[PDB]
Amino acid sequence: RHKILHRLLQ
């Protein structure tokens, strides 16, 4: 759902 934004936040 927020799949790719989580990736960039970490």
Add this chain to the structure above:
Amino acid sequence: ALSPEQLVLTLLEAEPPHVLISRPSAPFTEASMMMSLTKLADKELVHMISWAKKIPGFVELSLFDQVRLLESCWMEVLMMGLMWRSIDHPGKLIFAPDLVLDRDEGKCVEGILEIFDMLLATTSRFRELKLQHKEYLCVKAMILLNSSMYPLVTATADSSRKLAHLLNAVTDALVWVIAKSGISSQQQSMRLANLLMLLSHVRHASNKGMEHLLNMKCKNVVPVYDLLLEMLNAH
């Protein structure tokens, strides 16, 4: 780190890069103008995440609150950057150095001319106020930190207090920048009110732009990909 002179310098050093794009070789159509504007927005969204992580305290909020603030403000922050790039060029929107659209070019895409006129009018009010670069840095950070964050239920309490402390420090920093002008106390209160009243105009324009983009997507006028697609699907 949150004291006014250090906070303003941190915001200055956090600014994202200018993303470069040019016009197509062939005359614009409704489909090709939507393709150039959405390719630019998707790349700017990637750099926007790196900018938010540089604001003092932001990565100390819960991961859940980090995601919820960016979902709530991203279109507002793309429009505030565009307004600042266009502030000294009446009648033009400076999307990038090689993508400078005249107002009348919005006639190429159904429904976009109204949104261009909203953006150009709010740009003209910041020009009339003589908005300064350090005031711009504080108002753009307030857009990120100011949304409704109505309580939701997560599986895992200091994150809300942390958010109010950060928003208070940015507000104090904007009051400190205005106090450098040396104008009267009544004129300092009036300038603060004039800048913050324009936040509702940026939220109004971001609402009309989000509706416009979701309708162009549904009607298959423009395809959208990766980060831009994810932020739209989640909205």
